[PDB]
Amino acid sequence: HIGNYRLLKTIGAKVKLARHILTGKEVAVKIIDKTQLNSSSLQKLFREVRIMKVLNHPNIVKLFEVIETEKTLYLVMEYASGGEVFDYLVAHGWMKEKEARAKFRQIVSAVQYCHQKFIVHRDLKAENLLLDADMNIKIADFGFSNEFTFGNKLDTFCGSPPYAAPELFQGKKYDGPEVDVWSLGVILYTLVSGSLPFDGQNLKELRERVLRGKYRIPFYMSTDCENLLKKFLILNPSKRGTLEQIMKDRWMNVGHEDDELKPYVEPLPDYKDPRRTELMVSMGYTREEIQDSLVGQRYNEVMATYLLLGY
C-alpha cells in the first residue's frame, strides 16, 4: 500500500501493478530506491521525470502521479497489459505490412510529437514499445532522453547497439532528432521481418556492420517498404529524411487515402470538466485544489485522481 494505491503483483527498480483506491483504476507503479543512487543518477532521474510530465500523446505511456519519500520515488504510470513489442515479435515471428503499418503510424506520430516538444528519446527499440489492451502502441522508457535545441549538437553517445545511429558509435557531436530517425528505421525493419538488420557474433561485428550501413532486403518485402527504409537508414545524418517528410511517404499511407499521417496536435487542456469535478467533490476534494493541482501540473494526488477519472 502507498498513497491512494493498493500495490498488487510485481510485473517488472521494481514495477508493481496497483489499483487506485478512489477510482478503482489499474496502474503500473515504478518503485525507485533513491538512497543507493549517485549524484549523476539522481540528476538523470529528475530529468526523466521532468520529461515524462511534458509528454501527452495517446501512444506514449502516461505519467499519472509522482510520490516522494526520503528513501523512495514512486512513479505511477499507465499500465500496458499487452507487454513489449519485442515479446510480441518473438511470439508471432513478424507483422504483415498492414499490421506493421498500424503500429508504425502510431510509433512515428509519438516520436515526431516528442520532437515537437524538443525531446529526443534515444532508446527507441522493440523492448521500449509497449502494447495496451487494445493493441495500441505505448512508447516507454525515457531514461536516455533529453531536451534539445537546434542551436546545439548533443554530446553523449548513449543507446542500444543494434538500434544506434553510426554517429553515436563514432565520437560525433550530433543533431538529436536524426538519431531517433535512424532507430525508427531499425524498428521498421524488425517489425516487418522479425529480425534485426545489424548484428553479429559480438559488438565489434555489430559496430562494423552498422558503420558500413548495409543491410539485407528480404525478397518478400514490398518495394514501398524497401524505399521507406532507405529514408531512415542513411549513414550521413543530414540526408536522412525528416519525420514530417516521412509521414507523407507512400508506405505510411497505404489504405489511408483520406487520412494522411500528419503531426499530432496536442489537445487543449480541460481542467474544469464538470463531471470529473463533481465526482471528486463528493470524494471530498474541493474545486480550488483541483484547479491549483492541474494548473500547476503538480502530479500530486489530486491531479492523479482527476486524470484517472478520464482514462
Partner: peptide
C-alpha cells in the same frame, strides 16, 4: 539477424 535483447550503453564510442 535473430531478434535478441542487448544491454543499453551510456557511451557507444567504445
Amino acid at each position: 539477424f535473430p531478434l535478441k535483447r542487448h544491454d543499453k550503453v551510456d557511451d557507444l564510442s567504445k
